[PDB]
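Box 3.1. Reading complex inputs
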Amino acid sequence: DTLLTLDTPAAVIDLDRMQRNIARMQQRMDAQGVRLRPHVKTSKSVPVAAAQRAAGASGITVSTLKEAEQFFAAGTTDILYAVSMAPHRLPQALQLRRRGCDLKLIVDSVAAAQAIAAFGREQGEAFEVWIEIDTDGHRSGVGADDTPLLLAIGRTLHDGGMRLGGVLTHAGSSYELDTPEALQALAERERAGCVQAAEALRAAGLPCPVVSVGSTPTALAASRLDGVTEVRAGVYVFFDLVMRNIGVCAAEDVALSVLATVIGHQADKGWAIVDAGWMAMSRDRGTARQKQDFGYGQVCDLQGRVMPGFVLTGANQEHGILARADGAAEADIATRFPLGTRLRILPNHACATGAQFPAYQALAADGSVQTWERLHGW
Amino acid sequence: QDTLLTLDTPAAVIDLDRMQRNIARMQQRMDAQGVRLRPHVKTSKSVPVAAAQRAAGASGITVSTLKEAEQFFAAGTTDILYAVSMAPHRLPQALQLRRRGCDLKLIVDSVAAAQAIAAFGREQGEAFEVWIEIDTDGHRSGVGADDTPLLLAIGRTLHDGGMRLGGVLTHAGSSYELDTPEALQALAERERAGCVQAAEALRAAGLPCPVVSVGSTPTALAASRLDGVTEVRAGVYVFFDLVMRNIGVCAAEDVALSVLATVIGHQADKGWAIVDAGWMAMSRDRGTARQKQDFGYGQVCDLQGRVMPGFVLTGANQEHGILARADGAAEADIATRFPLGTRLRILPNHACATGAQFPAYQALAADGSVQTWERLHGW
Ligand SMILES: *Cc1c(COP(=O)(O)O)cnc(C)c1O
Ligand SMILES: *Cc1c(COP(=O)(O)O)cnc(C)c1O
């Protein structure tokens, strides 16, 4: 099985590229004196996380309890569920912990901390809960210098007989930046807010062994991480065009592409039609907001060579329109990409495109492939 | 019995009553037009959903992948139109489906694809049935309706080659760019007129063309006459969505698909409620952002699924939805107006994109009880 024999579209991981990505991130975190806790929401795949663990990762972060089940059943026990804890999901969290999953939960309100602690007391479980900090006004979390809410939550947890294990933050606004200076200042803001919260917890005599920060861009841009114990990053494993435009990788580093077959043309308009539509690429159009818009993806040849100036300018559910970015009509598009030619499309957003497929085709050095299943749903 | 209260979130909820209204209405329209209805299962990829389309009077189905064709044929459907231009490397799979008794139709829009099909047909003693895709509106594949030389060259390649030239089809997909009953009617007429024009030119040259197949949900509902057409193809109608609502072929109250979600927190001063349906649940689809009304990541309804007006998902991260006022003002006591643990239902931008985020649907009955309806994922 190789790139010529796969049915298309198919999500291809280039292993050499994935390995270089995994190594770059780990050596960076080593140099920073910090643990790396990869976010598996990018791949939801056991063998991709195994590769991250083999290079030195510690534990994982997950976006759903379903991911936690999957990775636990496959042997990972150090699992951070980094999404504000819904009380109704407490039974399921407890069941994971009682089965031996060292599952960590997060909260950002008093009421949520109250429900966890009461359930904990009622069930005889000291849940380990971390407090989410908001450092860039981007999602959930406790304002970095809203100490009263911080300590009120700290107290609810610690007085309540739960384990207050740390603070975390995720500076998601990284995604909107596109310079080294601004990413650097954003990473520093992420570090300082998170550490400031830790120290305020410790000043009030509450424990706070874990200080957890990160997004892929802040992970790669931070000049210093004093006071941080771990960084969480996920999308870096494959990279994607949004990250390329952010400035933290080149298009060549993108390890995930979508293998597509040319099924037709509109010669007239210089279009080649591929069987990779938005069902394959997903509807994500993150690069439309950035300084270089790649439509529904950057075209590469079968070998993985980027072909600048050809992108998917359009997409329907099961067809994509391959055409010139400069909007001119390619002359003789049919003779350039005859019926049946296979190409590889780089995604806007690796997390979104990977979710369209039941599996990855992992491409090894000899041109051979291995199917790596991934998780779908909740 | 699982209810909207016991289910986990996010969950794709089909209101069965609403779905049934949608199925009744579309079939009726086509009966009134004297045309067959060949439902496109790509919206749903779900056997029971197509059971109820066929129950209502449908004939055969349209699939968007040969995996859909595998799945429906296994479940007993034998009359299947694979309506994406045929890739030659897929020919063994198409052959094998036909050999097991699937009456599978293929489509092409070029001479080269017709030659490939016909050579493999010859080598394998299989007279494939092939239809010619017609471009009537410029947004995708197809032979131009007035491109008689290429039509005749494709038709003769199929026919001289021993294959069965079964018909022409077109799909006018620019119906989403429109929003008035007059523009929809003109576009449906243009779709009808081009497809029939193409069928008449094959016939005038002596080639068979007994099927003339048109359709998009909006055009199937808006067409006043369908002379010359033998079948209509419509899919998203089964559930509707906000793009459809915005286009004008249904109200928000006919949308049968919703995403059940739970409030997991707030940003007080910004007037935010946080829900566990981010773009992973909704999909990244934002079809409503270029239309008369923007619903960001979806219209917020309550548990019983009535529209709460002016509350939408204004942003979405992967597993986090941002529930705010569409008008961009910051709601006072958002936290009292949507308390932690409250479950809501979100109407989707695009039902085809939303349902594909789920392994299954939760098909909600009269009595408040749901049932898991699996749907297909992948290729
Ligand atoms: C996604 C995510 C990360 C990793 O972010 P990327 O930029 O996707 O690598 C870390 N922490 C949390 C809470 C996340 O949701
Ligand atoms: C999607 C599709 C339809 C049905 O269109 P909706 O407007 O989505 O119901 C019909 N024909 C073809 C070829 C399609 O791809």
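In summary: The pocket of pyridoxal-5'-phosphate (ligand 1) is lined by residues A 39, 41, 61, 82, 170, 214-216, 232-236 (CB under 6 Å).
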